[PDB]
């Protein structure tokens, strides 16, 4: 109870310390082709386990192409957590990232 | 008349002149003149009315630039020796050991002739915070940092590694190597965690700066 | 014209699920067996080549 307490200490401020501030954040103001096809990926996978959905999916059956869809819109409720080779990292959200 | 002495005068006038671009290049007040001497200039004043060379009036003292301290504050007096003998023994090079300490010489660089004697070459070490330099006349005849291949490379400031280590995020040994022993690394004078700026010419994106580690 | 001898699908496979080898428990070695595709170190490489992770995954 007492050294678990120190442990939880220990992890959030190590988490604290690799986290970049918003306003500190200094990579590509763009969605890497990798970032779009994993977004795509994951936020269709949510779809297909009945995650609610923030389009009209008129008519469609494919869960990836309801992501497409969302991604158009920007309503894909996701964020990318940029690491870098030292383990810090930049969180950006699907929103604010530029897709070609 | 001249067998082979004068091929040896120019290798030596051509030596002295690799040591002066050397201690320029580090950063000591060496004007462009000295480095610019011809071989005519070099006779008159380094060599005898018989035509042999003094390579004891060649030594000379250097002392850092008003733009070295403001980058480097710890950065002293430099004294380069060439010596007379062709085989430096264990009682020259004691003599050159004192010397640096006496005067209180920071740097000292050592031109000899053909060998140094392994006891001797202990002695090189054995003096801290005073380093000691050896090079071969033979292999300072031509300079390597003015070969097209060879780039050129900066040492940087404590500060200008701190700052590198921190854009990039990284770790002294994380950065790609130079040899403490490299040609160039010894050119320069580098010691180990001394950071060098290297600008290269690319054939895709023109001048482009990496960096280098010796360890 | 000479019909030449060769019935070149011959090698003509298809797998889902099939048999394992009971070390690996990998999809076990035979077309007739229905056996499995193997993707060795080069198809590895094409799929880390692509930067494509859950391809490889």
Same mark, same amino acid.
């Given at each position: 109870?007492?050294?678990?307490?120190?442990?939880?200490? /220990?992890?959030?401020?190590?988490?604290?310390?690799?986290?970049?501030?918003?306003?500190?954040?200094?990579?590509?103001?763009? $969605?890497?082709?990798?970032?779009?096809?994993?977004?795509?990926?994951?936020?269709?996978?949510?779809?297909?386990?009945?995650?609610? *959905?923030?389009?009209?999916?008129?008519?469609?059956?494919?869960?990836?192409? =309801?992501? $497409?869809?969302?991604?158009?819109?920007?309503? /894909? +409720?996701?964020? =990318?957590?940029?690491?870098?080779?030292?383990?810090?990292?930049?969180?950006?959200?699907?929103?604010?990232?530029?897709?070609? | &008349?001249?067998?082979?002495?004068?091929?040896? =005068?120019?290798?030596?006038?051509?030596?002295?002149?690799?040591?002066?671009?050397?201690?320029?290049?580090?950063?000591?007040?060496?004007?462009?003149?000295?480095?610019?001497?011809?071989?005519?200039?070099?006779?008159?004043?380094?060599?005898?009315?018989?035509?042999?060379?003094?390579?004891?009036?060649?030594?000379?003292?250097?002392?850092?630039?008003?733009?070295?301290?403001?980058?480097?504050?710890?950065?002293?007096?430099?004294?380069?020796?060439?010596?007379?003998?062709?085989? *430096?023994?264990?009682?020259?090079?004691?003599?050159?050991?004192?010397?640096?300490?006496?005067?209180?010489?920071?740097?000292?660089?050592?031109?000899?002739?053909?060998?140094?004697?392994?006891?001797?070459?202990?002695?090189?070490?054995?003096?801290? +915070?005073?380093?000691?330099?050896?090079?071969?006349?033979?292999?300072?005849?031509?300079? /390597?940092?003015?070969?097209?291949?060879?780039?050129?490379?900066?040492?940087?400031?404590?500060?200008?590694?701190?700052?590198?280590?921190?854009?990039?995020?990284?770790?002294?040994?994380?950065?790609?190597?130079?040899?403490?022993?490299?040609?160039?690394?010894?050119?320069?004078?580098?010691?180990?965690?001394?950071?060098?700026? =290297?600008?290269?010419?690319?054939?895709?994106?023109?001048?482009?700066?990496?960096?280098?580690?010796?360890? | 014209?000479?019909?030449?001898?060769?019935?070149?699908?011959?090698?003509?496979? *298809?797998?889902?699920?099939?048999?394992?080898?009971?070390?690996?428990?990998?999809?076990?070695?035979?077309?007739?067996?229905?056996?499995?595709?193997?993707?060795?170190? &080069?198809?590895?490489?094409?799929?880390?080549?692509?930067?494509?992770?859950?391809?490889?995954?």
């Amino acid at each position: 109870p007492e050294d678990f307490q120190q442990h939880e200490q /220990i992890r959030r401020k190590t988490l604290k310390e690799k986290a970049i501030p918003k306003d500190q954040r200094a990579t590509t103001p763009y $969605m890497t082709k990798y970032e779009r096809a994993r977004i795509l990926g994951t936020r269709a996978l949510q779809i297909s386990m009945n995650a609610p *959905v923030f389009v009209d999916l008129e008519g469609e059956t494919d869960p990836l192409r =309801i992501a $497409m869809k969302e991604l158009a819109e920007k309503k /894909i +409720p996701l964020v =990318i957590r940029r690491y870098l080779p030292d383990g810090s990292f930049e969180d950006w959200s699907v929103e604010e990232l530029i897709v070609d | &008349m001249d067998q082979e002495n004068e091929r040896n =005068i120019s290798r030596l006038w051509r030596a002295f002149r690799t040591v002066k671009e050397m201690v320029k290049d580090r950063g000591y007040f060496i004007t462009q003149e000295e480095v610019e001497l011809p071989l005519e200039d070099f006779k008159a004043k380094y060599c005898d009315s018989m035509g042999r060379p003094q390579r004891k009036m060649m030594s000379f003292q250097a002392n850092p630039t008003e733009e070295s301290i403001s980058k480097f504050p710890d950065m002293g007096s430099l004294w380069v020796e060439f010596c007379d003998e062709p085989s *430096v023994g264990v009682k020259t090079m004691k003599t050159f050991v004192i010397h640096i300490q006496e005067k209180n010489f920071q740097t000292g660089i050592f031109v000899y002739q053909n060998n140094i004697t392994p006891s001797a070459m202990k002695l090189v070490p054995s003096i801290p +915070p005073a380093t000691i330099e050896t090079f071969n006349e033979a292999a300072l005849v031509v300079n /390597i940092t003015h070969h097209e291949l060879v780039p050129k490379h900066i040492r940087l400031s404590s500060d200008e590694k701190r700052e590198l280590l921190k854009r990039y995020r990284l770790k002294e040994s994380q950065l790609p190597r130079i040899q403490r022993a490299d040609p160039v690394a010894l050119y320069l004078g580098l010691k180990r965690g001394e950071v060098v700026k =290297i600008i290269r010419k690319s054939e895709t994106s023109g001048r482009y700066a990496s960096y280098r580690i010796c360890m | 014209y000479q019909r030449l001898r060769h019935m070149v699908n011959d090698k003509f496979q *298809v797998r889902s699920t099939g048999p394992v080898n009971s070390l690996t428990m990998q999809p076990v070695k035979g077309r007739k067996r229905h056996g499995g595709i193997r993707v060795g170190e &080069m198809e590895r490489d094409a799929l880390i080549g692509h930067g494509t992770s859950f391809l490889l995954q």
